[PDB]
């Protein structure tokens, strides 16, 4: 109980520390924050997979940060981004396209 509260917790705050969050493992959740003047690139907040992602959505709905439905993205990110670290090069393009 005291570990799931934790977990709650840092998913809301995940959430809510990012710009956008792409979705699809079966599903797949990664938070983006780009904050132009402070991230010279974008950076990736999280990385939720399987029943997870249900959750996040919820919390996003509820945060009003928008979730977009961009399959390859997620996946691109999912296997070849790392959390905390910024995007990889190949995905700039893709990831301009839901923070536009």
Do not use: C
């Amino acid at each position: 109980q005291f570990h799931q509260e934790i977990q709650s917790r840092n998913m809301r705050e995940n959430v809510k520390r990012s710009s956008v969050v792409v979705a699809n493992p079966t599903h797949i959740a990664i938070g983006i924050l780009y904050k132009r003047g402070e991230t010279p690139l974008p950076l990736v907040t999280f990385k939720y997979t399987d029943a997870q992602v249900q959750t996040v959505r919820k919390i996003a709905e509820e945060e009003g940060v928008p979730i977009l439905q961009r399959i390859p993205l997620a996946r691109a990110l999912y296997w070849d981004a790392l959390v905390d670290h910024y995007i990889p090069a190949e995905q700039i393009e893709a990831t301009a396209e839901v923070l536009r």
